[PDB]
């Protein structure tokens, strides 16, 4: 999990949309100016909550390091979600939205592991939270995250 210089530069441009005066910090007033400029109207309490979620040192404003930490963490989340979606679609060989036992057995072989049907069936049972005998996308997400 890491960012390139170019990605950091883009996040600095995003930061500058919020840091209205260019001092290097985002205040609740600056975040509220942005939101109002988009037709929103959050309360002061809501704005402070949003600052606090990113404000790691508790000083009441968001600096670029704090902003970057947050954008990096969210980027890591988005990238993980895409990797899991791609892996799901590879397993769902016919594209019908469900991994069958035969698809699981064939795709694991293709990915480098030889399973018996005994093993395959056990894996389907482990994943199957809706009792339909197949692994759907949500079930696959739950296995890949726990």
């Amino acid at each position: 999990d890491q960012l390139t210089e170019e990605q950091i530069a883009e996040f600095k441009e995003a930061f500058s949309l919020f840091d209205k005066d260019g001092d290097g910090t985002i205040t609740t007033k600056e975040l509220g100016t942005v939101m109002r400029s988009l037709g929103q109207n959050p309360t002061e309490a809501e704005l402070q909550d949003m600052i606090n979620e990113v404000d790691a040192d508790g000083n009441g404003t968001i600096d670029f390091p704090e902003f970057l930490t947050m954008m990096a963490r969210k980027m890591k989340d988005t990238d993980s979600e895409e990797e899991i979606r791609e892996a799901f679609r590879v397993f769902d060989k016919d594209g019908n939205g469900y991994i069958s036992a035969a698809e699981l057995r064939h795709v694991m072989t293709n990915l480098g592991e030889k399973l018996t049907d005994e093993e395959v069936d056990e894996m389907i049972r482990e994943a199957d939270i809706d009792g339909d005998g197949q692994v759907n996308y949500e079930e696959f997400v739950q296995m890949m995250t726990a």
Partner: peptide, 11 residues
């Protein structure tokens, strides 16, 4: 870009 960042700031 504004919308993108706000999604991440939303509670």
């Amino acid at each position: 870009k504004f919308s993108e960042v706000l999604k991440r700031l939303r509670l």
